[PDB]
Amino acid sequence: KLSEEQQHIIAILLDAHHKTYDPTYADFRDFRPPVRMSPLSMLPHLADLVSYSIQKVIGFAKMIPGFRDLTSDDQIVLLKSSAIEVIMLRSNQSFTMDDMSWDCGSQDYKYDVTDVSKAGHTLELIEPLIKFQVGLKKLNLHEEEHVLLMAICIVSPDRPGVQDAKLVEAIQDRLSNTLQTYIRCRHPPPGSHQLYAKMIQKLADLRSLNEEHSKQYRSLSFQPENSMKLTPLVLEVFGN
């Protein structure tokens, strides 16, 4: 029972995603080179990758129905707290179970857990990250469910600093109902089974990954040697 409004929301989010996700990964040539041979050797390349992703996340969030109507302060707060989570979600499109790596076109842009450690992160984060990616890939989400989950993740009213939490919850409830109705009406069993519950559980997992990444980000960023290798956008969004 997907209403025209609900299909319209899906159409907007699908178009927003296709405008902001380049599955050819053509722009990876413009990043600083990945060097695999402190020696945070992958930090230049992955900082540019993450910085590039944040740009796409902002472009996607701006096209979420209702998001652009929020105040600038709330839009900023919502993007700052959700960016790391949306990055983890959108990277699942490139995540592969053949090898538990992120396959972005070529061997140069094939990222395993060694690259996340050569970006400065321990396995306090890498282990839950791979488990999240695997459990998310096993959901075999429709592209419609994938973009709705990203959108729902961004417009969460419980983010710190939100002013119009009821307006944010208004948007999210419409995306939530659209996702629920999409699963009932368009996702065939047995994949549909408890799909909404599993997808919302992934938002809880992302909160934990958000917390672990932040504590590791602040410890990495505290050393100016590492902060020098980040980008200005990364420093603005993730913090100084």
Binding site: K62, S72, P232, L233, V237
Partner: peptide, 11 residues
Amino acid sequence: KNHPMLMNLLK
């Protein structure tokens, strides 16, 4: 703490 790059990316 103020975010001019994020804001101009939001127009």
